[PDB]
């Protein structure tokens, strides 16, 4: 449709035309989209039309603008068109807000069960544990069974995300960042459920990464609120843009000097390439000890490298990284009020598809025959959703 194709391409003015047309003319009023019922300055209560705006049968104008994969660079048509800046607010404050905090409550409840089922794990033995009849022993096997059942849920809901909308080809991370971190959390736990019944003691290494990642995924739910939503967005851009492109610049200094230090001196703390890359990571992080106590052959050369390392990656590179992160923090905080609304629309559209049965709540603001006739017929039907505006003409 021409309406969805304007939304799937980032065209505000074409889309703001179609949603706010008022063609008042005989045999042309039925063509219109906005019907102004009355005006009483500055109030102008106008009944709109929701034909492909919210109607989830075909590609609706909201499912298109939300699922658009980070291209179509005229995004945030929400606050730029607005028969639907208030449709989202109507769906939120009436239907979606109560089911969102319930999901956040269950996920907090899931992580408290899972952080407590891991805090009281049995230490001795490597085999899958069998628990005798204890009040605390039975209450934690229920705690472990609930925890894996959550990891099954985020696994299948994560595959359901990939099959339904197929994101691919370097759009998996830019859009759809926060949906794959729930998927990685799930498969650390399924690996943990494999290694548990495989009688491997290393199951807790996979479970611990599933538990640290499970709590840091709790700031998925910050994304969507006005104030605290900016922190989850800029933690994403700093990993994906800043820290990911920088970690090939840094890693050629780390691997460059650590292969230099290993062949220079062959003693403890720098015998291997792995232990040398850790001691040189500690110098650029600041948390290293430049104690030149112990005697090496090529000790005086070693001080010249390690000072030309520290002055070069702790002074130049680390502060260069902080300066680039600081630009993407202050860029994304200026554009904060824009950046907020798209994440709620992705949540409001998702929660409406989760039920798929409550069609009485799926419609917004009733049917109304405001055309009065048609170009050929005398009857009509439309879904109105009026909205009262406050704009000023002097």
């Amino acid at each position: 449709t021409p309406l969805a194709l304007a939304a799937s391409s980032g065209k505000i003015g074409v889309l703001a035309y179609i949603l706010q047309r008022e063609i008042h003319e005989p045999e042309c009023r039925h063509l219109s989209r906005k019907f102004t019922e009355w005006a009483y300055g500055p109030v102008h209560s106008s009944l709109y039309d929701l034909s492909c705006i919210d109607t989830c049968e075909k590609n609706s104008v909201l499912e298109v603008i939300a699922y658009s994969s980070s291209e179509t660079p005229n995004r945030h048509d929400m606050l730029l068109v607005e028969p639907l800046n208030r449709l989202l607010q109507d769906k939120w404050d009436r239907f979606v807000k109560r089911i969102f905090y319930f999901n956040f409550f269950v996920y907090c409840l899931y992580m408290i069960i899972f952080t407590a089922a891991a805090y009281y794990r049995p230490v001795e033995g490597l085999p899958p544990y069998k628990l005798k009849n204890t009040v605390g022993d039975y209450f934690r096997v229920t705690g472990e069974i609930l925890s894996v059942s959550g990891g099954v849920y985020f696994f299948f809901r994560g595959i359901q995300y990939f099959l339904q909308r197929r994101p691919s080809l370097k759009s998996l991370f830019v859009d759809s960042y926060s949906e794959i971190l729930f998927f990685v959390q799930s498969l650390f736990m399924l690996v943990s459920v494999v290694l548990y019944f495989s009688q491997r003691k290393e199951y807790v290494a996979s479970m611990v990464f599933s538990l640290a990642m499970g709590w840091t995924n709790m700031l998925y739910y910050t994304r969507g609120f006005q104030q605290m939503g900016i922190y989850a967005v800029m933690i994403e851009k700093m990993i994906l843009r800043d820290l990911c492109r920088f970690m090939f610049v840094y890693l050629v200094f780390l691997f460059g000097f650590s292969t230099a230090v290993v062949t220079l001196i062959e003693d403890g703390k720098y015998n291997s390439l792995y232990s040398t890359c850790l001691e040189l990571f500690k110098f650029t992080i600041g948390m290293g000890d430049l104690e030149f106590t112990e005697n090496y052959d090529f000790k005086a050369v070693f001080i010249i490298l390690l000072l030309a390392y520290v002055i070069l990656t702790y002074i130049l590179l680390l502060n260069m990284l902080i300066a680039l992160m600081g630009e993407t923090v202050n860029k994304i905080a200026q554009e904060s009020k824009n950046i907020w609304k798209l994440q709620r629309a992705i949540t409001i559209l998702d929660t409406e598809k989760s039920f798929l049965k409550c069609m009485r709540k799926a419609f917004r603001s009733g049917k109304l025959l405001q055309v009065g006739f048609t170009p050929d017929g005398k009857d009509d039907y439309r879904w109105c959703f009026r909205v009262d505006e406050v704009n000023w003409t002097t």
Binding site: L126, K201, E202, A205, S275
Partner: protein
Amino acid sequence: DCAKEGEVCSWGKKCCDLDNFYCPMEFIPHCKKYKPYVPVTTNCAKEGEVCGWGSKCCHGLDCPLAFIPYCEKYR
């Protein structure tokens, strides 16, 4: 003026003589007796086996530091 073993240290009074009572740190601490110095018991990882992932390395061998670290005798 000491705080006995089991009583609350770190707020009113410190623990007694350090043969028995350390504090510890956990914000409402209780003066706890030390455990006995026990060596590397079973379920250890022997020499040439992988330490640092599944099991500790034993008493007479370091791990010491690698990605997949194998135990080794000292030089």
